[PDB]
Ligand binder design. Structure first.
Ligand SMILES: Nc1ccn([C@H]2CC[C@@H](COP(=O)(O)OP(=O)(O)OP(=O)(O)O)O2)c(=O)n1
Ligand SMILES: [Mn+2]
Ligand SMILES: [Mn+2]
Ligand code: NA
Ligand code: NA
Length: 327
DNA sequence: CATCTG
DNA sequence: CAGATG
């Protein structure tokens, strides 16, 4: 956790680059198990050979660990930090819409910067365009005090459209968090479930409402159940308009709201121990359901949940206020 | 995983 | 349809 921090980190840079610049997934994958093992490892790796000793740790990695331990640095790491090509790919990639794949193409065409991007707005698609338009705003975190106004909004219009809607703002917002990065809304309706055959309108009508009153400004992606957009809190009395914010909205069968709802609330960490404990308590849990684990090895059967309450209970746990879901 | 591009 | 993105 700090004993092998450097090593784990360099390995991480190294891993990252494989995947992003080069396309060495295998190699890339290599750095990752390595870092994961050297991460859990209890002592102070004093050398390469010491590390080699681990699974995941081969000769190459070992070599690296050595040079790194030997001197506060790594050549290859040094060479990568310079190389403008590598840097460019790391940067283009910040644009929502551009991944490595694409980060690669554009570079090979000469688009390496933001400007390049603007000039070549033609080669970009819709999402990327948006991303480009809001690069800045995209990176600003969401101050909790804003979230409240936002939540305040979605929740009223959702209501107006249908009294039966049930929206929940999950995420870190939901977890206490002073600021968050995106707004995720969970959505269900009594009239939408496991079996029931669809009702896309369910998701569409709200989306519309939101843009009706101008809270949603753009559409990144709109499906029958998942919507990815951009939104903004109405600028008050002209002087300080708000940044454009990322927002996702998801339709869920009413029969698996809470699992989902619970689940998005995270944190990853809160998740697992819950999952793990659930496993003890004789269960199973995922994004949509909880299930009584048979003994034959495994087994299913969607336990019936009417709250986050019904869940914990299952696993015979203490109901965790959202804040306390930290880990 | 669900959505988009091409 | 494979392949990309979040
Ligand atoms: N690959 C992933 C990503 C997320 N999650 C969970 C973690 C919380 C939830 C949605 O949260 P995000 O917006 O991804 O993150 P957050 O925890 O809300 O953090 P923030 O919004 O501050 O970035 O999904 C998961 O199980 N697996
Ligand atoms: Mn989030
Ligand atoms: Mn999200
Ligand atoms: Na990106
Ligand atoms: Na293939």
């Amino acid at each position: 956790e700090t004993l092998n921090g450097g090593i784990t980190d360099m390995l991480t840079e190294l891993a990252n680059f494989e995947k992003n610049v080069s396309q060495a997934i295998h190699k890339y994958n290599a750095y990752r198990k390595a870092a994961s093992v050297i991460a859990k490892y209890p002592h102070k790796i004093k050398s390469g050979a010491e590390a080699k000793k681990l699974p995941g740790v081969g000769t190459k990695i070992a070599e690296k660990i050595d040079e790194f331990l030997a001197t506060g640095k790594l050549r290859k790491l040094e060479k990568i930090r310079q190389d403008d090509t590598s840097s460019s790919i790391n940067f283009l990639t910040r644009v929502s819409g551009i991944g490595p794949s694409a980060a690669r193409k554009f570079v090979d065409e000469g688009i390496k910067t933001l400007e390049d991007l603007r000039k070549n707005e033609d080669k970009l698609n819709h999402h990327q365009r948006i991303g480009l338009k809001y690069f800045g705003d995209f990176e600003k975190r969401i101050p909790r005090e804003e979230m409240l106004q936002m939540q305040d909004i979605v929740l009223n219009e959702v209501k107006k459209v249908d009294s039966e809607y049930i929206a929940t703002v999950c995420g870190s917002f939901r977890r206490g968090a002073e600021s968050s990065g995106d707004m995720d809304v969970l959505l269900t309706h009594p009239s939408f479930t496991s079996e029931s055959t669809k009702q896309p309108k369910l998701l569409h009508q709200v989306v519309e409402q939101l843009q009706k009153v101008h809270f949603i400004t753009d559409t990144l992606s709109k499906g029958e159940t998942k919507f990815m957009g951009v939104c903004q809190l109405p600028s008050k009395n002209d002087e300080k308009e708000y940044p454009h914010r990322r927002i996702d909205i998801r339709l869920i069968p009413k029969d698996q709201y809470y699992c989902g709802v619970l689940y998005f609330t995270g944190s990853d960490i809160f998740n697992k121990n819950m999952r793990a404990h659930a496993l003890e308590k004789g269960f199973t849990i995922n994004e949509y359901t909880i299930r009584p684990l048979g003994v034959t090895g495994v087994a299913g059967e969607p336990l019936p949940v009417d709250s986050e309450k019904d869940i914990f209970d299952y696993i015979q746990w203490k109901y965790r206020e959202p804040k306390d879901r930290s880990e």
